[PDB]
Design a protein around this nucleic acid. Structure first.
Ligand SMILES: [Zn+2]
Ligand SMILES: [Zn+2]
Ligand SMILES: [Zn+2]
Lengths: 168, 144, 87, 94, 65, 118, 49, 107, 56, 196
DNA sequence: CTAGTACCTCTTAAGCCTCAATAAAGC
DNA sequence: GCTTTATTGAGGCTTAAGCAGTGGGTTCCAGGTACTAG
């Protein structure tokens, strides 16, 4: 319903504002890096954690919005298949796209895509998708999701052979 | 940690510092080969203070290392401990003096006792000297 | 006339590209659109959907579908039985 | 005169027949697979095959980095169209 | 420490010793007994000593010393 | 600071004159000798604050790629600026940004606690 | 090397757009490195915009 | 039992076998600073007599090589000074069973 | 102690994804990898270097 | 509807799949694993763009890891197994003065880090001061029953003219372009090593 | 003359050899 | 006191390993050359 979408959008906006504030604090060297972990890695971990928390909150809001009459929710409760992540991505938010255990790297010169200027660490430019499959994905979000899917496919294709060799 | 000391965070950080591997590379901001014509007089007017406290024979070469105060505070490293470690590693080959921590700028002066091998000696003293910790240790993180 | 220019991989590193002709230049159902933070946009895409290949373009609403499913559909489309030529 | 024309015609025919792209038939490092039988299961399949790209890197190995599509592929290589399996991440379609 | 020789025309009969401390390259053949000495650098190699010996032999033969 | 002979266009090795107790730059190829202006011989700069602001040119602000910003310039109070990050790439480099003003081509750090000329 | 990279790059772009030079040629100017690269070799993938 | 501070020269190592009837074991000061047996991972090791070894072999019907092997230089073997052909019983605590008794024979 | 550490690491890696395997299988695996004097890696340089049947 | 774009061989329709290759005439700088002594290697696959194409993989390697105290750079000249210091190559080209070599390698004299890193290189290359000596040293390796002083200096000069950076030119009229290109390659390698 | 017939053409695990110090025995 | 030893180990090069099963379509019957039988 409309109220649920409005609440999800508000939560996403709050998460984006928090990420922007954290980035501004980091730029002014006002953020204390975690012990051992470097400043860049600490900032990336904090941003990823915030985005994951926002996505989880949006998924929880969607799930509570859905009623027992909902078919997807009923199937998930049955335990046949699906999970919280599936409902969240289908109705609330796809979430951050991780490649090699990290956000989308600057493939170009300090630019993830040509559509973004150099030194753009905002979530939208770092693989984050703020639109569920229902509404659709923007071309940048689509490309990031494609990169994530390619990474997953390659990982499966290599790990199947590795596991077979180990089992042998 | 031991059950008695497992409830104290100060003891945990003390143990972490004791076992954490500390090297001059992490703390040393820079190292330069300055020239000191005489021990009594220094080319840098501000450097004289280092020998002033000494007032209150040696080769005409100087090696000046500038460190990071923030790194010292974070790692709890102190000038006295590193000086003692250097003296232990080098009994009398090189004379080393360090400024008091209270000074705004902290530097260390090392000079070979009575130039071609000076670079090699400096490289060995930087890379092959450990202030404290255990070899083959990168970082130690405490957790609850 | 210079209305359309060819750009290679190397040149893309030194240009900013707008998503739509009139979106970046100037009912919560429409997908969220990234704000036009920049103001230069020396170039722009004729249409984003053209990034898709021959098989991918056949997929209806590829964005609405997960990327692995799109890849599977692209692989499977080559095996679909249908009229390949009129002769 | 006395030019052996077959030397060129037969060589080209062999190169386009088995896909062995080499200076001579005896060569074992000809990097086969350059030429492939055009697929005509459906018109879309033929179009995709005609616009297909191949990577000389061996299909074996477990290095994911080359297989992953770089950000530079935007607008040049289809993000989704790609074979699944050993050839995944190596065979690309523009 | 194996190189060809020109006096006896025997291959692999030449041995070169490079004393970097004294910076001296000495070339000796185990068949004809010919011995040659030259100045060398830390980057010198036995091929350098062989080339120097060949150049010296050519200069001596030409008589343009 | 490192200089050359200025006559043969060659490097100068350092040497110590104990009789004069001085550091002198001279090349063994020739007889040229000079007295070092400053007592600088060796420097490694394990951590370097220079080189992060490199490549700046007069037409830097005209690059579309550089992201714009509306921060007021300290001197000319010009809102228009182009902001970028540290040029040097490292796993420990700070994320401090640098802003260049088109009107005066002045580079200033985003940090407010300390003001940096470059 | 060239002293006025901006003017040369603008002239090259204008000529390429007008059609005097083959559009397939790729010209890239990097201010950070202050380097101008021109590529005409075959096998280069390009798209229209 | 002889304990050294820094290291042992090879001359002493080759001289040690010079006395068959008397067995001499060399230990490092750093190695013995902390007792290994007190560790939780290491189970309880009990030396077995020749008669006990013979009885175990007879009951289980095993040969010398069928029993699990333990390195001569194993820290536990040095701690107990186990000799060649000597069987040691290891009592371990497990989740599946209250305790388990295994045996190991030096190679 | 090495066998116990190997078993604990095997259990941790197996349970990382949530999959559960009975303790007996892990115990047998660590025992076979440690039945010899040292730790016999599961490779052509480990158990395959033992004195088992030639055809095996 | 048929788009053609294939070859009819023995009736069978064969299509040639596009083959991906690393672009030539470009310097690519890659790091090396810690166990290997090399630190950074810059490679260029020079090849003629008009005819008589042949692969010329020229690689310049910086020996010595971080803190090794040996910051030396050696370029693997084609047909020369033993890597030669860049100083000897510059001397052979014609840039004998050390200052000229440094200026070609480093454009901005203000940056003293590059000069400090290159100091060992010039220190080790100081032995060579003549073009003939540099050519002879280059020709030392890969002996094929020849006399270094007799019809080998010309052979080494021809190799340096053709084998070394064939793409930039194939004539001896202007050999300074090769020196400038080598200096640019070394500058890129040093920039990559310094992490800038 | 013409056409058969054969004939020359990417990530580790162990093994081994090759290297640079080091304490004892010769003398 | 000086000289020559066996030992120690440390890396380079090398030879190995590289999910399982299944369906199908293409191409090889090899090039020229000399010597000799009908
Ligand atoms: Zn001889
Ligand atoms: Zn001079
Ligand atoms: Zn301004």
């Amino acid at each position: 319903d409309g109220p649920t979408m409005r609440e999800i959008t508000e939560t996403i906006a709050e998460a984006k504002k928090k990420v922007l504030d954290v980035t501004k604090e980091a730029q002014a060297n006002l953020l204390t890096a975690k012990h051992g972990m470097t400043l860049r890695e600490s900032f990336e971990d904090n941003v990823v954690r915030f985005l994951n928390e926002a996505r989880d909150k949006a998924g929880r809001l969607a799930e509570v919005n859905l009623k027992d009459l909902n078919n997807v929710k009923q199937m998930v409760m049955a335990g046949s298949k699906g999970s919280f992540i599936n409902i969240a991505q289908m109705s609330a938010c796809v979430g951050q796209q991780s490649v090699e255990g990290k956000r989308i790297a600057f493939g170009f010169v300090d630019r993830t895509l040509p559509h973004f200027s150099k030194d753009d660490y905002s979530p939208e430019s770092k693989g984050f998708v703020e639109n569920s499959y229902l509404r659709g994905l923007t071309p940048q979000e689509f490309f990031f999701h494609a990169m994530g899917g390619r990474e997953g496919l390659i990982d499966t294709a290599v790990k199947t052979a590795e596991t077979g060799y180990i089992q042998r | 940690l031991e059950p008695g000391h497992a409830a104290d965070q100060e003891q945990a950080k003390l143990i972490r510092s004791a076992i954490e591997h500390t090297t001059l590379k992490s703390v040393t901001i820079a190292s330069e080969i300055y020239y000191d014509p005489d021990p009594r007089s220094t080319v840098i007017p501000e450097d004289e203070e280092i020998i002033q406290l000494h007032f209150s024979q040696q080769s005409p070469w100087l090696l000046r290392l500038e460190l990071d105060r923030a790194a010292m505070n974070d790692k709890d490293l102190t000038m006295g401990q590193v000086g003692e470690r250097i003296k232990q590693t080098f009994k009398n080959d090189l004379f080393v003096i360090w400024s008091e921590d209270n000074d705004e700028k902290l530097i260390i002066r090392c000079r070979v006792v009575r130039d071609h091998m000076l670079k090699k000696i400096e490289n060995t003293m930087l890379e092959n000297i450990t202030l404290r910790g255990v070899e083959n240790i990168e970082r130690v993180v405490m957790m609850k | 006339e210079g209305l359309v220019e060819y750009i290679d991989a190397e040149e893309e590193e030194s240009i900013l590209i707008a998503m739509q002709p009139e979106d970046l230049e100037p009912d919560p159902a429409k997908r969220i659109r990234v704000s036009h933070h920049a103001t230069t946009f020396t170039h722009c895409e004729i249409h984003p959907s053209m990034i898709l290949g021959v098989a991918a373009s056949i997929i209806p609403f590829p964005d609405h579908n997960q990327s692995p499913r799109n890849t599977y559909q692209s692989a499977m489309g080559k095996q679909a039985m249908g009229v390949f030529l009129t002769n | 005169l006395a030019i052996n024309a077959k030397t060129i015609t037969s060589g080209l025919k062999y190169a386009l027949a088995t896909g062995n792209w080499g200076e001579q038939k005896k060569a074992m490092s000809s990097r086969a697979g350059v030429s492939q039988v055009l697929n005509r299961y459906t018109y879309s399949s033929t179009l995709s095959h005609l616009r297909r790209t191949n990577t000389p890197i061996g299909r074996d190995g477990k290095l994911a980095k080359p297989r992953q599509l770089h950000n530079t592929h935007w607008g040049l290589v289809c993000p989704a169209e790609t074979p699944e399996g050993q050839a995944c991440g190596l065979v690309k379609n523009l | 420490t194996k190189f060809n020789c020109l006096f006896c025309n025997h291959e692999k009969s030449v041995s070169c010793t490079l004393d970097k401390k004294n910076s001296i390259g000495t070339l000796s053949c185990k068949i004809c007994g010919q011995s040659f000495q030259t100045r060398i650098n830390s980057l010198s190699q036995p091929v350098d000593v062989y080339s120097d010996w060949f150049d010296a032999v050519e200069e001596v033969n030409s008589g343009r010393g | 600071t490192f200089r050359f002979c200025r006559d043969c266009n060659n490097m100068l090795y350092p040497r110590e004159d104990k009789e004069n107790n001085r550091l002198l730059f001279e090349c063994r190829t020739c007889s040229y000798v000079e007295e070092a202006g400053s007592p600088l011989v060796y420097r490694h700069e394990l951590i370097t604050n220079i080189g992060e602001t490199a490549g700046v040119v007069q037409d830097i602000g005209s690059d579309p790629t550089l992201p714009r910003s509306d921060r007021e310039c300290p001197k000319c109070h010009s809102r228009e600026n182009v902001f970028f990050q540290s040029q040097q790439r490292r796993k420990d480099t700070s994320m401090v940004l640098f802003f260049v003003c088109l009107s005066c081509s002045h580079i200033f750090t985003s940090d407010q606690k300390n003001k940096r000329t470059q | 090397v060239h002293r006025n990279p901006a003017r040369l790059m603008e002239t090259l772009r204008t000529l390429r757009r007008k059609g005097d030079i083959n559009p397939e040629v790729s010209m890239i100017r990097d201010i950070r490195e202050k380097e101008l690269k021109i590529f005409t070799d075959a096998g280069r993938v390009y798209r229209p915009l | 039992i002889f304990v050294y501070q820094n290291n042992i020269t090879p001359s002493a190592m080759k001289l040690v076998p010079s006395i068959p009837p008397a067995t001499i074991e060399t230990f490092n000061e750093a190695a013995l600073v902390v007792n290994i047996t007190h560790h939780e991972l290491v189970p309880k090791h009990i030396r077995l007599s020749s008669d006990e070894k013979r009885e175990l072999l007879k009951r289980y019907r095993l040969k010398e090589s069928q029993l699990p092997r333990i390195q001569r230089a194993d820290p536990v073997a040095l701690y107990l000074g186990l000799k060649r052909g000597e069987v040691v019983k290891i009592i371990r605590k497990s989740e599946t069973s209250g305790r388990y008794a295994s045996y190991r024979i030096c190679m | 102690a090495g066998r116990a550490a190997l078993y604990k690491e095997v259990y941790n890696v197996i349970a990382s994804d949530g999959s559960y395997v009975n303790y007996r299988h892990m115990a047998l695996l660590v025992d076979v990898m440690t039945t010899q004097g040292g730790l016999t890696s599961v490779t052509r340089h480990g158990f395959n270097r033992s004195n088992t049947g030639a055809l095996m | 509807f048929d788009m053609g774009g294939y070859f009819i061989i023995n009736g069978s329709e064969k299509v040639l799949i596009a083959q991906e290759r690393s672009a030539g005439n470009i310097v690519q700088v890659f790091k090396k694993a810690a166990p290997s002594p090399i630190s950074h290697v810059a490679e260029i696959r020079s090849a003629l763009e008009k005819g008589s194409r042949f692969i010329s993989t020229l690689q310049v390697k910086l020996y010595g890891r971080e803190g090794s105290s040996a910051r030396t750079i050696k370029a693997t000249l084609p047909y020369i197994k033993q890597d030669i210091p860049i100083v000897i190559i510059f001397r052979a080209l014609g840039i004998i003065p050390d200052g000229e070599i440094l200026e070609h390698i480093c454009y901005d004299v203000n940056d003293w880090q590059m000069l400090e890193m290159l100091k060992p290189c010039v220190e080790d290359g100081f032995v060579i001061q003549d073009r003939e000596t540099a050519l002879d040293f280059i020709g030392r390796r890969g002996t094929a029953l020849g006399i270094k002083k007799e019809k080998r200096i010309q052979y080494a000069k021809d190799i340096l003219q053709k084998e070394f950076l064939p793409h930039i030119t194939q004539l001896e009229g202007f050999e300074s372009r090769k020196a400038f290109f080598l200096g640019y390659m070394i500058n890129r390698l040093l920039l990559c090593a310094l992490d800038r």
